[PDB]
Design a protein that fits this description.
The structure is cut from a larger assembly and holds 13 protein chains of eight kinds.
Chain C: H1 14-26, H2 29-39, E1 43-44, E2 50-51, E3 57-59, H3 78-82, H4 85-88
Chain E: E1 18-19, E2 25-26
Antiparallel strand pairs in E: 1-2
Chain F: H1 3-9, E1 11-16, E2 21-27, H2 31-43, E3 47-58, H3 64-73, E4 76-77, H4 92-95, E5 102-109, E6 111-112, H5 123-126, E7 127-128, E8 131-133, E9 138-140, H6 145-148, E10 155-156, E11 162-165, E12 171-181, E13 192-205, H7 212-218, E14 226-228, E15 235-237, H8 253-256, E16 259-274, H9 280-299
Antiparallel strand pairs in F: 1-2, 2-16, 3-12, 4-10, 5-9, 5-12, 6-7, 8-11, 13-16, 14-15
Helix pairs in contact in F: 2-9
Classes of the chains: A mainly alpha (69), B alpha+beta (101), C mainly alpha (89), E mainly beta (33), F alpha+beta (305), I alpha+beta (168), L mainly beta (44), M little secondary structure (24).
The structure holds zinc ion (3 copies).
One zinc ion (ZN) is lined by residues 5, 7-8, 10, 22, 24-25, 27 of chain L.
GO cellular component, one term (chain A): nucleoplasm
Cross-link (Glycyl lysine isopeptide (Lys-Gly) (interchain with G-Cter in ubiquitin)) (chain A): 59
Family (chain A): Belongs to the archaeal Rpo10/eukaryotic RPB10 RNA polymerase subunit family.
Amino acid sequence: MIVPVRCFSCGKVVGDKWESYLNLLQEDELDEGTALSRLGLKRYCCRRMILTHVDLIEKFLRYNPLEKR
Amino acid sequence: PDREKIKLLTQATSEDGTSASFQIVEEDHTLGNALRYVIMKNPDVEFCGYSIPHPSENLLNIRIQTYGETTAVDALQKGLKDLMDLCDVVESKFTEKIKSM
Amino acid sequence: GYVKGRFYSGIKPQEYYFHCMAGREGLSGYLQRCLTKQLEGVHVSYDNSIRDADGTLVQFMYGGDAIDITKESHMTQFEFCLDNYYALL
Amino acid sequence: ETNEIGVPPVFAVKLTYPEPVTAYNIAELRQAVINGPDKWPGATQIQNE
Amino acid sequence: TFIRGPICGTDNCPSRLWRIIDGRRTCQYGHVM
Amino acid sequence: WNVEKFKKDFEVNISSLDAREANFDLINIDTSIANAFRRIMISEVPSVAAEYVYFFNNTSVIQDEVLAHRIGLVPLKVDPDMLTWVDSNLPDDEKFTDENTIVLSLNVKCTRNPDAPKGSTDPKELYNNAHVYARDLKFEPQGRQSTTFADCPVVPADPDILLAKLRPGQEISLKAHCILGIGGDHAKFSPVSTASYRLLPQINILQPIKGESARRFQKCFPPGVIGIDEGSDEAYVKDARKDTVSREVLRYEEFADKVKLGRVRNHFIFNVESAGAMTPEEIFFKSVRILKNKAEYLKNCPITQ
Amino acid sequence: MNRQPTLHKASMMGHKVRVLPNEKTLRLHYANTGAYNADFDGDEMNMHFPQNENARAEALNLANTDSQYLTPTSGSPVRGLIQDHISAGVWLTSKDSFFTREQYQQYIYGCIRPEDGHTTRSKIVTLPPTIFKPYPLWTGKQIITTVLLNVTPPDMPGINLISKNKIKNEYWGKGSLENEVLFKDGALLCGILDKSQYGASKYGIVHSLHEVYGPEVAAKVLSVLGRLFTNYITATAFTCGMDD
Amino acid sequence: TTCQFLTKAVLDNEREQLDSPSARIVVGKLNNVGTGSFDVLAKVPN
Amino acid sequence: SSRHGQKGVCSRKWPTIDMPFSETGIQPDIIINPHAFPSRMTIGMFVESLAGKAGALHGIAQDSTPWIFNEDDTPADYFGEQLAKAGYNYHGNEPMYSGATGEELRADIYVGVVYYQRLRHKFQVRSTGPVNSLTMQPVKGRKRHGGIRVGEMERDALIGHGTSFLLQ
Amino acid sequence: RSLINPGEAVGIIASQSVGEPSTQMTLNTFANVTLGIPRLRE
Amino acid sequence: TGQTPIVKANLYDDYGMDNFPNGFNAVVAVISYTGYDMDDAMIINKSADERGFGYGTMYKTEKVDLALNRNRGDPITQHFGFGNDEWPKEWLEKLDEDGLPYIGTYVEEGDPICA
Amino acid sequence: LKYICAECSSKLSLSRTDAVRCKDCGHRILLKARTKRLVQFEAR
Amino acid sequence: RKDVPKVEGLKLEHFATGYDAEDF
Ligand SMILES: [Zn+2]
Ligand SMILES: [Zn+2]
Ligand SMILES: [Zn+2]
């Protein structure tokens, strides 16, 4: 749903890396493997976490029962 | 003290005590393998191995048989002491290399 | 439907499809009940005969020979019994 | 062992034999009753004579 | 665990029945019938 | 063998040390012991992490237990030596003390922003406090801690960890108790973003290989591993330490005959990354010490018959 | 223990209880899948707890697993090892297989479990090494001989068997005799061990042991071999790939 | 066909001797097979 | 289950210190047994294993539409070349070590990334429990302590043994 | 010493030795006689 | 938590399948090792699990309708809330003043979900 | 303000025998809303 | 039929721990 905090296998913090990773792909126009490297994700353990994350939460958030649409 | 940690399995320990089996609680391969490595360096030990009955009961079984100069319990103690000393050697060596680095 | 393709290098999409056909193709109780319900009380008697529970004699021998099937494997394995003679004794 | 079955404690604590109490087992059954219904190996009740 | 009802089937109460699902029914001193 | 013979032959090489990761070799030690340190570093070196989370309110889209879980994964920059262990046999009142426990609070409400630049997608300008970060965990000192931790406030090691997201009207309100624990119990306590080793490469060539074979042979290993010497024109090994052991050589028929791939066999190349609380070297030291105490604690226990 | 459908009596056998901390499911040795027709794909079993000593005696002596090595259909084995354990055996008993004193002793103790009812001795017996010099080495076949030596009765001569396995001599090389399985006085002198020897397989080693020494010993050998191969697999493991 | 066979039994004024496995299960009698195929007696001195 | 009809039942949640671990220092999320393959011939899973690992390494989505490859252009070659360019073994094998003994396993083991599906679903246990008013036999239930039944298939089994006391 | 027990339910066992193995005849391959289960029923 | 598959059919994109994630990319090893994975049984990494892997949820909706007995537009006997007679008080641990349960409450067998 | 209207979203409260409906909409379907209270969790 | 197109310019993207791209 939202970025996981740690990599499942490494233990390495990964949750501070989602918003920046998107900005790398978007703004700096890098490919995925270059951007992952720039964020320090070396082990394929860790590259997998950010490479394949689906920010499904951003869908959930569009249904907010506490505001007049 | 704590009497529940290690016990003798009297049904595989001989009269002369040159052969014995011990059951140690709360220990796996980590200590077991290291301890048999050390014990087997003792020249009076004729046999030694460890085993883990089951991955789900925290138990470690050590077997020691000697050639008759010391008892099995002696070999366990020399092994344990040898192991402690061995760690000291490592800690000290590592310290020196960090300093000298 | 002769398929020259092999699973390693794949089948013609064509082979795959035909191979689905073959796979899908393949995709006694009452009899057992009736045998057992009639045979349920037929047993070996202390006289070696085979009797029904009401005493009716069905066979004269367990097999004509009284002989357990589960103790039979080595009865004619003579050379295995001749080595191993002493342990058997 | 090939002739055993691994029983989860969740079962082991709820299944009782009704054990008759004798000289040979009074030590064991004392402990079971002390352990109670919820600490394995324990006991859930006593049948009187 | 209460139901008050069914006093107790032990003439040194009557003390006070709760039923457990296992059907013992239990009175406070500790008859299970 | 003999402990002195070991002392004379054992050797340490420190390739790179840093505040987060260490790369070093242990040379001439037995695999059983290298493995011990490795296991201990991952699973038995204590750390501080959130264990109990007390919610007073959470009307976010993320469920309590899940939120609690992530907070538990946040690596707290706390020296585990500054804390004593909790005794889990006491009632809750007695259980948690100023030597036992660290308290974190979290208190966010999301409101709508009036001054949003009309036609905006960014939730920073659309909403106030839409995004909740680990840095938003406030450290609330208890008792003596106002003094003890005055020189080192409790801060997550990775401030920018995304913890939750909200929309207008939703609030989160929680206190967390953080205590000592070990990785073997739960991985949130492990102090490593991983400690592991590899055995050192040994590439030994079973006869000279030169000319066009040398160039070919050289390309079966990463850049810099295999050198081609000027003069003899034959190939030789520059540094095995850069080799990844892909065994690529062994594919090409012409070479599979002329190379054995091995290790300098005990020779362990350790790589230790810290989750952020302690330095690598501290974590490795602590493990070498932990092993020694196991042996010492056992030597001093009476053997019951 | 019971798995449905119960189409013959071996789908309802007596097992000895072993309580295991932290488990939430019933744990069952592989050697029983045959009988129960069990797959481990989320299939369920029933555990019934007989409630008086007559029923105890019957479940331990009549419907107990241990006897039921041979089926009554044709009188052939239903219990044996499978998969990892067969692959492991081909490897461990290969001529190329050698072990140092340290390894040999460790394989032995890891599978014997001498702290059991099989106090055939209250001291583990070992063989001398096959290679004395330049370096003390034991072979895999010696691990087998050592196993049998520690679990068969001491007051009783070692098993004698001439058998064959599933692998033709040609597969090992010129002059090989590894297809021929030879046990002399309880020692494996030639041949590898196979699905034909400790699978559910008529006239292999475990069925032979069953005849000469009875079902208790055969069942023990089967469990021992199981741990040996399981351990051997954790130490050297297992095979894959596209390349194959 | 329970009621048919029952009707037949009644009109024959039949006695069920209780020897078949089925009959004994009906009445709760120990089966005639097996560990039940003999009696046990205790040898008592004095 | 993977997307190749290889369905499995979780047998253990294996402690990660006890799992095998790779030269890369990774532990597998899931183990599937090699003996699950030769009868089913899901060779497409083996392909997915290479392709997925190569994709995770290069930052690459891999197209696995049927019939894009052929006998002159195989995926094992294609994805294998991609792994080799990344620096891993071309056949998708990887060296691993036993979590228990610490030692390198006998051969490189086949590892990769495969998309897995979790299948939706319950056990039952009874001590004793509620009986029905008319027959005094165990009620039908589960959600109330349901008791299995010893059935006639079980009756016949008990006769085939003749455990007469179990029957009684 | 290979003699069959007095007491053996040979009747039940014969039934199982015909019914159980016949479940392997639920299908068929591809004189001209009746086969498998249908025949066993006849 | 679902993931997009790394290995994909292009049609997976065309049918918008990412809108309904259906699985996750596991690190899978084809290995005989645990001994618990024969007969199509499989192993899941304990730490992987503890870190969220395949970490799923189930939802059940129950309808409580105390107009179930009443004979059609009848006088109403039962009203959600509490009376003024004497009742447990432990009840307020699960239930708000209206007789409905506070949102978020942990509830195990036997607890009140309604008053 | 314990409840919420399901249609118009107006936050509102009820009383003893009160109009089970939104005082703005007249919609007769109300969602419960939830209040500062201690729930305790273990971070595992 | 055309083969599925090879992706051009693929390099090593994996190295043994303790090394990186420009060590090759
Ligand atoms: Zn990772
Ligand atoms: Zn009473
Ligand atoms: Zn409204």
